[PDB]
Amino acid sequence: LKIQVHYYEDGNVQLVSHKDVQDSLTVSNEAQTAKEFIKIIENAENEYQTAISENYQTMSDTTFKALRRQLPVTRTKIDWNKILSYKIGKEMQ
Amino acid sequence: ETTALVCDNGSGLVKAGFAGDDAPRAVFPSIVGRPRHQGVMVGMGQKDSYVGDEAQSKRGILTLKYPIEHGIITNWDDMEKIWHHTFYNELRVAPEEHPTLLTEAPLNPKANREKMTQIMFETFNVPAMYVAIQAVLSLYASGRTTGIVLDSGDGVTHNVPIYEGYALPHAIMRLDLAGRDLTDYLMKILTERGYSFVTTAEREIVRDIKEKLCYVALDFENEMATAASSSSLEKSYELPDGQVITIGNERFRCPETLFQPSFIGMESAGIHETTYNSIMKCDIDIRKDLYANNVMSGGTTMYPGIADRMQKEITALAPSTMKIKIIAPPERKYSVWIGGSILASLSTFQQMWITKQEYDEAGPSIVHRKCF
Amino acid sequence: TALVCDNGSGLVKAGFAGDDAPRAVFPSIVGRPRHQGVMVGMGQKDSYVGDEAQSKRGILTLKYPIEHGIITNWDDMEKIWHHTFYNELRVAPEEHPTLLTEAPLNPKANREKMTQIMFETFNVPAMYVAIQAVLSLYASGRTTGIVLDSGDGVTHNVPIYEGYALPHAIMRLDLAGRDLTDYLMKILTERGYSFVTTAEREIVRDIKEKLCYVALDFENEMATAASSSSLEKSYELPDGQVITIGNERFRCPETLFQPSFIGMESAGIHETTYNSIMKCDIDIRKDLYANNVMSGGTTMYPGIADRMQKEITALAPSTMKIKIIAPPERKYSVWIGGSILASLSTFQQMWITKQEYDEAGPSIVHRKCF
Ligand SMILES: Nc1ncnc2c1ncn2[C@@H]1O[C@H](COP(=O)(O)OP(=O)(O)O)[C@@H](O)[C@H]1O
Numbered sequence A: 001l002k003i004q005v006h007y008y009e010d011g012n013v014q015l016v017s018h019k020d021v022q023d024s025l026t027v028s029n030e031a032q033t034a035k036e037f038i039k040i041i042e043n044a045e046n047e048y049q050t051a052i053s054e055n056y057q058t059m060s061d062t063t064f065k066a067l068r069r070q071l072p073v074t075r076t077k078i079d080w081n082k083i084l085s086y087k088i089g090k091e092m093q
Numbered sequence B: 001e002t003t004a005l006v007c008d009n010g011s012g013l014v015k016a017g018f019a020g021d022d023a024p025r026a027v028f029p030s031i032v033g034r035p036r037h038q039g040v041m042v043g044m045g046q047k048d049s050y051v052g053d054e055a056q057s058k059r060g061i062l063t064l065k066y067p068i069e070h071g072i073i074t075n076w077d078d079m080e081k082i083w084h085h086t087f088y089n090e091l092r093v094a095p096e097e098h099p100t101l102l103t104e105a106p107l108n109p110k111a112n113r114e115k116m117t118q119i120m121f122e123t124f125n126v127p128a129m130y131v132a133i134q135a136v137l138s139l140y141a142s143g144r145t146t147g148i149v150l151d152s153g154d155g156v157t158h159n160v161p162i163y164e165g166y167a168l169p170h171a172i173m174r175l176d177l178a179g180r181d182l183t184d185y186l187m188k189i190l191t192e193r194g195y196s197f198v199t200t201a202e203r204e205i206v207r208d209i210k211e212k213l214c215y216v217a218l219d220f221e222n223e224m225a226t227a228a229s230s231s232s233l234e235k236s237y238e239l240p241d242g243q244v245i246t247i248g249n250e251r252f253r254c255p256e257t258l259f260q261p262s263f264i265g266m267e268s269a270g271i272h273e274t275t276y277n278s279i280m281k282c283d284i285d286i287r288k289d290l291y292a293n294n295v296m297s298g299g300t301t302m303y304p305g306i307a308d309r310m311q312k313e314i315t316a317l318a319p320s321t322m323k324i325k326i327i328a329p330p331e332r333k334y335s336v337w338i339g340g341s342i343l344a345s346l347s348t349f350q351q352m353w354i355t356k357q358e359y360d361e362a363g364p365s366i367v368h369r370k371c372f
Numbered sequence C: 001t002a003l004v005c006d007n008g009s010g011l012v013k014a015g016f017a018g019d020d021a022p023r024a025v026f027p028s029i030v031g032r033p034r035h036q037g038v039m040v041g042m043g044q045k046d047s048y049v050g051d052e053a054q055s056k057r058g059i060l061t062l063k064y065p066i067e068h069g070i071i072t073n074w075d076d077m078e079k080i081w082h083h084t085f086y087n088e089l090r091v092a093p094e095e096h097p098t099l100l101t102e103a104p105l106n107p108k109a110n111r112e113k114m115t116q117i118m119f120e121t122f123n124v125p126a127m128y129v130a131i132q133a134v135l136s137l138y139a140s141g142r143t144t145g146i147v148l149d150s151g152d153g154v155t156h157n158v159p160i161y162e163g164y165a166l167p168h169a170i171m172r173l174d175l176a177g178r179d180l181t182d183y184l185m186k187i188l189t190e191r192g193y194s195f196v197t198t199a200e201r202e203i204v205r206d207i208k209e210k211l212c213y214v215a216l217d218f219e220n221e222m223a224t225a226a227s228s229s230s231l232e233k234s235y236e237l238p239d240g241q242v243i244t245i246g247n248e249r250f251r252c253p254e255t256l257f258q259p260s261f262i263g264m265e266s267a268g269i270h271e272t273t274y275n276s277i278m279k280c281d282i283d284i285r286k287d288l289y290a291n292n293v294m295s296g297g298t299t300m301y302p303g304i305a306d307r308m309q310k311e312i313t314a315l316a317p318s319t320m321k322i323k324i325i326a327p328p329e330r331k332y333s334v335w336i337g338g339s340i341l342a343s344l345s346t347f348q349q350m351w352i353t354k355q356e357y358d359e360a361g362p363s364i365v366h367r368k369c370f
């Protein structure tokens, strides 16, 4: 399963994604095995799309926070007149 | 060679000394006593006021006043007397050659800090002064960089979470319930057995009773049941006039107000719930290290049952998979002063002082610019 | 006669459909006794609801059943609905269909339990649940625009095109008037005033409703407040004490534009509105920029329209016309829109009746209702 999206209105953003799904099915006459094939296709692609949506839900707290936080751990903006007060607190082991 | 002075001005005690030492040189009560009777013998000293231990020595003929109530200085002339007796009588130094470090409770009025800066710079005129939060100094003395500090003294019980040296200001909580309210509540409940204490000198006696005989129960209802069942929890105390009193269940009802503030009519939650609310107002990925590094500081954390009770209450409030460790050092009565000496003995703190020329240029409002 | 009830996080606005104004506006609080009762020649209840709580709050602990838009206590919400139906409206809920309101982007179990309680305990012939910002746009006489709904628990930015809300552009900020009241309680400690109790929280709420405003330029307002005492205002306490605040009048609503003042990660309401507009298609952005509609009591600060105009003009392209509509009755705008919707002719076949709830269960509200 592959998805590719490009969006370039004022800047640029791209998404590439793929997933490999392996399952098994029983074999019978043509109509029943066709229905089973459609059923496993549905139950794979629905979970893939729902997982993509839930991954977009938690981007700003799990993966984007690992690169740049939205606020520091003090939950406030930096007081630029007190840089040494931030630097002093890490010198005591 | 201009060594710095570390002075902790609590609501009940003054802990003052030199930077670099491991123990405060001067520990004395923050009281001013004035005579309430008339003097009939002439030819003596007979001074109009008494500061510190001399006020406590002749407290029977004096009325006692505290210049600091709930962390806020209310009387400034009495605080002038306290600081003058600190510098010139308890330390024997001239405060023109030593920069000074002072402590303050969080969420205090700004006028208190401005007036402290003003009285340090043009009454006891210092080359430099700094004002610091007490709980971050307790964590500096504890040897950690992350953790939540519960500082409880005579006026203010405050919880401050610090993560890697960063004090987190939106999770700092303050309660105006401390050892003086506990002393007043024990003074009230001592009238059930017939012991009546009224005057300000007898408040010191009730405080001594509280320091010697009170403790925190692990389970309050079982302790009340076993106190009513048997006379095995009673203890006896001797008054200055030789009379003996006995308390059986006032020993654990007095520090139960720290866990149930409704005993004195207050609507606020307990210290355990305040700690849990301070942790829950932090970031979700740092709550493990905050739960593992609970630090207790101050004189009201010196009851000999309080760590196990706080452990039980926090473990009840916390989720079941979390590890809760509560650290109570044996020297936690003086922990703000030790961390203050550690902070004042550092090389990178020497640029953080508020100098005299900066006070002359900016007036008494630079303390909101250079100090947290 | 239909019933329109707006159960907000801080106020309850209920009345009959067709009237132009709500008939019952009362605080959504439950008060319980705190002290020892010593007199026996008295009523001596155990729970006080609404204004009776506010007239007795000095001996009471107050509780809000709704926190941050979602319902935390359901017994207290039952008490609120009982007091609304039987004491403030004097109606019988067995005879009247009842319209209900709900904030967007909410858990579904809240709507499930709302329908279950309204059909099993306060049995109505029919009920319906509507979105508040859509009704606030309906009350303003338009069908296309973006609604900024800021109340007591939530702030929402909802864009509606041709009567349909756009769910992929609904933005939710968890900052409203309760957080502003608590931040004012925090910043009044600098001048020496201590407010701790739940009764004093209402006093600080009254101070915020009476004295605060929104600065046009925050840095210049802080510069002018630190130069002279031309901005200091006085307030008289219930016990006769007089307090004076100088720069807390505009620092408290600045949390709407700088949410980091209380330690929240999200952006201000101007950036939230610009993000809600910018998620839409280009051909409707002109209509959404021209039709900004304010709603709720937290938009009642007397500086918020000009400041919002300045900030959205700064964010938007320079060829775009920005118009912000702040109706003078926007404290009651969800109720008026619900009155308009419930008095429509074709709306009468969109009621969820009791028979369909019997045949479906507590899940019909996700199929027949939005
Ligand atoms: N062992 C003890 N048990 C109970 N209370 C104590 C004990 N030691 C001190 N206290 C209380 O601590 C209060 C002051 O503690 P401390 O924090 O050291 O001073 P301050 O509050 O002035 O900073 C006193 O009022 C006293 O009642």
Ligand SMILES: Nc1ncnc2c1ncn2[C@@H]1O[C@H](COP(=O)(O)OP(=O)(O)O)[C@@H](O)[C@H]1O
Binding pocket: C007, C008, C009, C010, C011, C012, C150, C151, C152, C153, C177, C178, C205, C208, C209, C210, C296, C297, C298, C299, C300, C301, C331, C332
């Ligand atoms: N004049 C005013 N200025 C600022 N805020 C106000 C004013 N009047 C009311 N508010 C705020 O509006 C909030 C509730 O408004 P409203 O939206 O009508 O109720 P709800 O939020 O319960 O739906 C209250 O928290 C109150 O603080």
Ligand SMILES: [Mg+2]
Binding pocket: B008, B009, B010, B011, B134, B153, B154, B298, B336
């Ligand atoms: Mg202290």
Ligand SMILES: [Mg+2]
Binding pocket: C006, C008, C009, C132, C151, C296, C334
């Ligand atoms: Mg509302």
